[model samples]
Target chain A: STGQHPARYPGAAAGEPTLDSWQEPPHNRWAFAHLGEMVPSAAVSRRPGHALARLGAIAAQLPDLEQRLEQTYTDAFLVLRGTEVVAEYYRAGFAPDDRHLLMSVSKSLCGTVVGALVDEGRIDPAQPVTEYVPELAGSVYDGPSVLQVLDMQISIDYNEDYVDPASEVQTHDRSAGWRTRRHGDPADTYEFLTTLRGDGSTGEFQYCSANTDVLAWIVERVTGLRYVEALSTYLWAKLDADRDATITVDTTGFGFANGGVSCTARDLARVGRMMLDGGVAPGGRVVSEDWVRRVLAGGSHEAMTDKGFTNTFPDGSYTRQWWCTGNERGNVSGIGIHGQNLWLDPLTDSVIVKLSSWPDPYTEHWHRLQNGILLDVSRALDAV
Target chain B: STGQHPARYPGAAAGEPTLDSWQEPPHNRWAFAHLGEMVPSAAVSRRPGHALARLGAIAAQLPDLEQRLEQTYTDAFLVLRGTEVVAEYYRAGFAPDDRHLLMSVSKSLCGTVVGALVDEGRIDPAQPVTEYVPELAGSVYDGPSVLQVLDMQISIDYNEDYVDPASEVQTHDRSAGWRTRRHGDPADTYEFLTTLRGDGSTGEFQYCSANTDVLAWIVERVTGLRYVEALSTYLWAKLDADRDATITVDTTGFGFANGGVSCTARDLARVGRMMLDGGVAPGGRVVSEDWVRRVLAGGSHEAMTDKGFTNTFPDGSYTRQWWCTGNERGNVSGIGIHGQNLWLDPLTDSVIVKLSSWPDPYTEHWHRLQNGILLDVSRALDAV
Candidate 1:
């Protein structure tokens, strides 16, 4: 029911094409509109200034953009250069401002916040989670240091099967209290997290939502404030955000550090640009350079070797909540569902943010097209 | 079960002294600690330049300070003032950076945005509601002009009985799709409005949530943008707000102009200061001078006759979404549920924002205590 069924849904039967099937100069217009609906990622905003104005000119080209972009993209797409919006085209009502639920992007943001705590000497990544939140004493995270959680290589018996209804993914939805229908259920995210029991070993790269939730819980506990409060204090206010961004908190007001943040495209770009600028704004660093560099460098762990280097990406690695597109491009990006991307190329001094609500979940063709677009945009900007 | 629980909730016991009993100077300390748990309202942020500073005085003594001031106030009390807050004596959990919800305070914000539109000649308040939003062509609001809605004198047959579940106030909640345990209801606010057959003639003085919703709808329809977008363009971004404020949108993304805005307390003060400065900011006028003056002067209508006024503050009157304290030390204020007050004493060139979470729903004692607090603060500022 979830995959392509063009016969049943009329437009659904188009049968997705493989990356190899797409010709060069592939239908990127279709890919741009459907980036988020396909991918499992986090959102990133573009940096403001001359960059935004430049990107806006590119966005003006998306006129039959939706139908055209859909040929390559199975999910969603949003585009921003610097802080100015270039284009946002979605199949449905996925406007740039709509907060597409970020699956793992939440992890990176949580990591950044934790780094801020470390900078303040409030939290030591080497310290055990039980130190700040004794409630997790006997849980799976009981023995792991904060650094292990950030690294995502946790030794946990957690399953992230996206297709299985009974998989850990379902637990994530249940933990968020996001039922198919708005029926009687738990009220908030904190209440949902409290109901979970951990079974994994700490310090191993285990991609689990529970880890980030625990991190969020720890952040709140140590700060003597809520996740939103910590974010507002250490990040949002300091950014001079043009608009208020929201992180969906559980009923108890605990934020889903693993992925629940909603923000305007402009603000998202600002954050991306800040990251690109080595945590510095026009005047000063909002977060420490040490933290930013550590995040961009992907953690101490080696890159995943089993994936055999995906065709669309040259060098793929995960850093503290950020995705590193290694190779000659030297790009680090924040990707979110269905096609929300904040791509930063420090070498080119370029930041590109794309927000989308695509329908396809997995079709490498769109990824190639998106990367191509980003490369072109970055190269063009570098020449400037 | 909804109201007047005797002996069940200790706070609502019978024979409690109206002003003195309900508002014990000692209780103010505890009240500050639990503001959100008690009442519903939004937060506003204070501009950085005018960040609230500790007066280096005890909070409990604030009441006594008001007693020595010669101003007309029915009652007064102080919550958290700067870092050395005294909500009865408990310090506020979140700092000045934290955002809070502004209820009807958002209405004034909507009005300000509307003023921008008016200044641009994009909206004509004198025009019928149907001109911009034809959806309301046959509704009770069909007869009134936009100016009347802004002035709080629209002759719409809608009730704003906050305590009554069956009243239009509850309808708004149901329409906005705010989660509630109670079910078996209309699908949306649009449907709820369709059911209302106005009882009064156009231009009649009536205080109704519908008036503001209609205005919001009109703004959205005419501008070809959502309420949030309009707000960003006309206000939030223009004000150089330290943080982005959120205004809750309906199911269809139309902001609740009647209420549903949350901001940091300091931001609320900043907004008040903005209005006090006649809609002008460090950059320029976010709203027209004429519009600001008209709104500050209580709109174009007489406040004494509004329906919301006749029922709640029989002695006071309403203008726009703000309440006129009826020359209480020559001051005007904006008030919302559970003790949200934004008092602007033009004579003193002072704006005071008090955000609280009072358990009581618009009690006489709460009003009196608020007035007393404002008067005291006025005197304190004047003395300075």
Candidate 2:
């Protein structure tokens, strides 16, 4: 959505998704929606017929919208007023039909689904993940309550530096089909998780992508469903989405819940809409308003704020796989490292979905700029 | 369309389409339409609003219809009469929207597209394949007319033995995302095709899957389009298809034209109907009428007689990637190894599409039984 389609060459067009090109521009434009093509995936099919109100001139109305989008390589960006799509735009050659990779924003999706499950009495936030997936019995994840995984307050010996090829995070990526397999690597997600071991407490907020995946495993374990189908049942199918969402899985078919979610920019905004609407869908309630309040409540808790986290949110706290901006507006966002953001501003009654393919995975410059754009749009939305 | 969906499992279930599961029963049921998830793929988008005729229960009227389908592992099966659906049935869990993998039937699809291109004067059937893809100059594909490749008349050094661990077909499959990649192999389609070398000619009609992929490469090369996009522009977009179809691609994004196509059973029947109606689509002509005639003409020609080929079509000849039954009624079929088929009979004004996932890759028992079912339906439809 950010740029033009690739030249019809025989193969990888230098730093494309095929060549594992996600941290860059051209390939990110295609790869984000096409992760399933490169790796094994499962569908998140939604029932047809969710009505979307016209996204009228919201783009034209915002003077700085194009400039903000152009600054970070945007694939697709969308805006929502209440449950209606106020404005939407795809990059030059993309469409709402196109699916984009959510990067770590996928974890936030997992977060919401976890919230819904907790409301359904299918999952207990206080239960150890191993109660459902016993295979994690001895790992560092064995003792963490599902809520701890949700809050990411547990200490885990995992490094998420994308540039380091030897990091366990890369191995996790390899296991999830985000990278090519190594010769002696575990064949799938379950096996890969078996190799991790660590420990910590709820006193400090720690951000770990694996925690979301472990949470995903617990979802599958507790619900008697594959994460993909669970996504359809719990979220996507309920959203009246225009197209199906996809999740890339490991070789053995375990979905990458930490990331690997490919969906349209509008669809992601629909999730944001569901969140802002007190966990209700267009027709009826699909999630709990209590759960929607849980995210903001947990963010405002004294335990979660002021831990000196400076990279993404200058004055914010992390809670429930969401970045809670430490602002009066109570703006929280689901973010992916390579510029994927779904910002929900309850005060403004607005939801913004921006899928980007920035040159770098993480930079204070880019993150600050992206959040600034969202804040600007959020403020302008108040006028609308 | 054959049976109920699998129970939720943590990882790839037995016979689910994971590593080497396409040839098996349970997996093929899901895999045929899900090839894009297991491997890389490109979309063949369809314009909305294709008029679908109601399919009355012609199945219940025929006593053996259910039994025949059950015996053959039918996922989705349909009968059409001149663009109107006559009868259709799906396995308990598969939907009409589910896209079944075409397998070798994909070759027939490639054939027709090539024929369309030739008819459009965009491709010269008499020219060597290297004319479009010069990279194949030294390979066995060299010096053969594009028609020979389409017809599979040239004997290339290739073996499609599915069970063999070290076959070129497997290599091609690996390149095409049907199989896992090896340690030191060519990473993409063009590179894999370059590794192929050997020679033979018109004395025999060799059925090789790689040839279809090569023809697909040619389709991309000559037309200046991605094979997937070209398919949408040239065929699917014109067919008023029920849903978008997908074709799995090699690592470098080269489509696996031989057998990666997956679409709804009725969508495939549309192709059969298009052929039956002289390549005219719902609104107007999409494929050239002459190309449809070429398939039958080449099949009935003297050059195709007595090649000692004994397979599904007893008195049939192969031409233009289609198996033309030497029957005067003029029925041809597109078949996949694991029991996928599209049968068209002009005399009866009938087109039937059946997608299946049998226990074995190539089986005379299944093939004969499947063809018998089609023959019975074809004969029975004459009275309709």
Candidate 3:
């Protein structure tokens, strides 16, 4: 059933799923799950096995769950409560094994690897990022500490606008091999990073995807491995993930650590399950307990509000590549544009992963709907 | 260890690894094993399991085997006696799981699928080519029969030269999504086939790669499944292959069936084993025994000589996508441009597969050497 689906862009006979069109409707539906087919991908290995538990249990509790999933364009959905798969659902063409693009959710995985290395004393969080990757000395990443890169506080002269064709994000996409490279753009992702001038706001929660790439580069430098290998060694392998994960790579085989990870919903749920258990996997501790506590202790609410996330996040904070809900449930999540989420709720002991191909990249209504559903489900599970 | 290898083309900082250069050294060594990462690929699924047996036994029998493997740029090698794996060797960096590009050897697999369909009476080999695909009415394939396509006897105004920049094969590469398409090129592989003009020599052995693609298209039409799915259903699933195989695809998601299959050496050895056992897998029959007999009965020796394959395939023939050795042992092989071979020796009950990344697309010296090694190995196994 692997090659059953067809590429469905009716307008162009031979459609070019460009940076502009890839994340948009019809195309995104196919491209999100098939990114490895379009761009270069580096494999992150994992030794196997996870079995499905209670099927549609959450759906029975929430009557509108399935409808809401369809409305959100969910590709694969899995909700786990304390390592038990409480609910799992896959849309027609997708399977539990299919690797869905994580978009910016890739950043949190990068953060996880960094935390593991930091816990092992291999990476110094407070050290200048250039200590690990000295090649970034003359760039915006020149003076920023590794902590700033992890927390998305280092500002660069780049916009993360997904819709704008001329945005730095578009150029970044091309550099990362997500789109066709134009004539005079930065040669590759690393070269593009070296060109980003400092915006002089090192403490601001600017949320640049490039920061995670820098974090990934640091992980590679400290571990003496590629970013994907680092992730496999640090987290994926430890979790005994169901399948190999992959990250879109640049021409130099650099992992597009910012938003290029593609993984099964269940495998990502394992990441959530590990985090829900406070950085401990079934095999052993993946990161230090202290690192888990640091992730739970979200960064400045002031920075988030200042960045105009006041309405969506309220008192929420962005820390360690995760968005804190600032709620009593101790909810934190790794979210990506076009509806990809890995939500970890400590109070309910729940980890929910929603892999989707939303019609639009940054849809506020869809985000609220998906988040609300996850919260309600967590509350419902808590009551049970 | 999975993501350890790096892409190496130093000419342009961010190497393209284009159609012209991907099959050449420094790049081919990487590109051959990593084609799925660089191109759009569709997976052919197989229920798995295969274990290494008697590793390095072939090396003991044939000294300098490893050295020759290195010299030939072999990625993976497997030799089987009856059902037992006698010798298996993988170059450093290539594991048993790694897939090496099959190039034109893909045609044999495509031919096998057609054979299966013909055996089931679902496809009549003698029917007009356009009977299955009426869309090719005005093309060079308009009057040709399925049998003609299978035997490479249909004449088309096309050159199969691998080195010529302006050759039809280069244009075919672009159409198959193996290269960057020019502005006025045919939309995709299927369209390119329709644009070829007839050369008025339907009985001549032209060896155009496009013929196999047409066979694949016909398979898709008859089976009502995508080429990949049909491959999975017809042959791959039956072989109990160790891993899923992949084929490079065009923009329309049509598989580049001509020269796009990438598979592991052991899995390919399974194919050779199946053919050796008269189209029967360990589980059951793959193609009819009669079909297997037809394959063993090679096509016109005169056509092969006319096409200057006299030296390469002396007194031999190209039938059902296989090159017959015309020897007492009844040896036949599926050979690719840059050192890919699936050799079946019925006399010795031996199957040998060499998955290599040769420096040049067409090297007579390497071909002769690889073939000689296989022949010698087969003879040795026969003596045993």
Candidate 4:
């Protein structure tokens, strides 16, 4: 069946939460992969010379694989080892061509891009934010180190509640062109960010999505490439992805590097596998192994323990925009607003990627359950 | 080698016209192909399975070719006969991947989208413009039939001048995201059009750029597809472009269908070739043959007399967003501001496509000279 006439298909127009609902089930079965239709997008094309080699079976070792999937409304799930896809499953509605939204996982993609830029000396991490984009000079972003942005230590006051339609995260969503602009709103993400005021260096970690966008902007400014182009050249193409990935952008054509990435589960698992291999892409070095270690380098966990996400991630550290498991496995994953992830455990040589659409925006239980599945899958693969 | 960092190159950042100078020379040479950098844009990707067939030269017949090209500041020029590319030239800085802005040639692309939608019975040409986009009800476009909009017979009172920076055309350019928004101006193209008043039935030909944007809005509303997707499905993919094509969009992400199209000269010539062959695509039907025929149909010659373009092609007729030379050559061209054209002579089975960046926006003398070159090229091909 062809995928071009998306809006004309059955269950497409009359779905439970049609078009605008990214967090609701059945609707997200189509929405996540098809965000380019609603939000404007730029492609991160997969390299032409590389193909993902398929190798497959370990499902019998885990119990209620189907139940955990249904409980969380998983769209696509895959478990992988180096050069092998041991287990893969997709709900009937999902397919190889479909690209699920990365949500906050997009932030990790930006983190990797930052690492590549920094390692090449294309960007200076120590430079203040205003050094790149002087437009932010008078705003809360002035004088904040790019490193502070990567560590999620920026003290920008942004309300991220998803329930309220008028929250700052929603405003960011609106400004980023991820959602329709309400009457009399700023035309772009950069302008919307100017409205915020901040208390510099609160000496604590905040899970503010706004800081990730600032990092994306810096990546764009320093590299002189749009967020999507930098994404394609530095990361996506090197992953040998199954298909092209798309990033959501603001009206100014600035990419929403925070949570706008969307790709299929198989390709996402490839990204995780590549991370385990130290960010070396098929073509050449994407980011150095040294850079990747620095990415997972631990320093933010002590302050992040009480930041509310740690209960699900427990003592989980976040450095370079990735969520550290803080477990003996020494693994990390790219997390999202809805249930989307790319979990990699270098210790066990295993990866578990689950792309989902939950009814609620922040499901504490979903995060706990996904982590449980990750640990179970990692243990099972290690035994095999 | 690597096209990743465009801004760091010699002319990339230091060019005079820079981002907002579509109407200025040297700057346009870069900005046209890179409109995605200046304003927000959506990509119309090339189909993977198909590519334009390259074929066999017409240069020997056209004397003073080098001088005319230099005088006009041509960016990319191509002459094609059937499946063969007769001759091709790109300025030192321009490449096959570059997409020079079409200026008003974007209107003809919109014409084809309109024709396809009408043939599908999804849109009726006789219906008033306000039916699909009710937001245009109070605007000057309120009572015009979709057919009127297509044939350039609408009585909307818009200044056709491009020399004045403060003109309505320039304001529309700003509102449509082609130019930077002036302080206290309407935020997007839709709001800018709402500010115009119609004279109703001026009983003559008036080439209002605003009407094309309205057609684009209707196409988006009726197809439930954005302008770029509709364009990809119905046009560009069918052309088998060498690379993706981009159309500049308003801040709201609605495409500026009037003159925002930018594509490689070769891909643009492929469009002309397709028209000469009656709109048959390699992948079956992109638009009905009847649609293509109707597109080149003509009847408005008398009304167009002294409307400013007549001197270039005396007694030329106009219909369906295309210009028809009322001569034995039986030619139709997608003409645009400052020397962009897709001139096709169906009788001779040939096309001449030239993408240029002139010193001024609307140069009457330049139009006349380009028309002379087009007729000369068509005659030479006919003799061959």
Best lDDT among the predictions, by candidate number: 3
Task: For candidate 3, write residues B1-384 as lDDT tens digits.
Answer: 011111132232232455334333344333433444453332211111222333455566778777777777676788888888878887654557767767788899999989999988999988998889888887888898899999999878887664564678888887766666677888667788877788556777778898998998898778766676677778887888776776666654467777777677878888888897889886567788988888888888777754335675667888888888787777888988767889888887888898776656665688778877878778777666
True contacts kept of each: 0.00, 0.09, 0.07, 0.01
Where does model 2 exceed 4 Å of error?
A1-61, A300-315, B1-61, B282-284, B300-315
The CAPRI-style docking tier of model 1 reads incorrect
Chain A, model 2: TM? 0.81
lDDT (Cα, tens digit) per residue for candidate 4, span B1-384: 100111211244322332233324334332222233332332212111122222224556765776677677676778888877777766654555655667788888888888878878988988988788777777777788888888778676677564466688878877765444567888666678778777777446677888787788788778766676678877777776666666655544467688766677877877777777777755446567887776566647776765466665676877778888766666788888667888887876878898776655566788777777778767777754
| lDDT string, candidate 2, A1-384, tens digits | 111222312243521434333313333323323334444433322111121223366555666677677777666778888776777666654546667777789898888778778888998887887777777877787777877788887777777775576678888877766555667877666777777777645546777788888887778767766576676677777787777777665543456788777777777787888888889976456678888887765453444543334444456777789888767677888888667898888887888888876766677788778877888778777764
- Predicted complex 2: DockQ: 0.11
Evaluate residue A97 in candidate 2 and report its C-alpha lDDT on the 0 to 100 scale.
Answer: 67
Task: Estimate every model's Cα lDDT from 0 to 1.
Answer: 0.54, 0.68, 0.72, 0.67
DockQ of 4: 0.03
- The estimated TM-scores of all candidates read 0.59, 0.84, 0.83, 0.70
- After superposition on all C-alphas, the RMSD of every candidate to the true structure, in Å, is 16.3, 11.0, 10.7, 13.3
DockQ of each: 0.02, 0.11, 0.11, 0.03
Cα lDDT tens digits for candidate 2, B251-303: 43456678667677877887887887888876456668888887765553444
Please report, as a residue range, the 10-residue window in candidate 3 chain A with the lowest summed lDDT.
Answer: A1-10
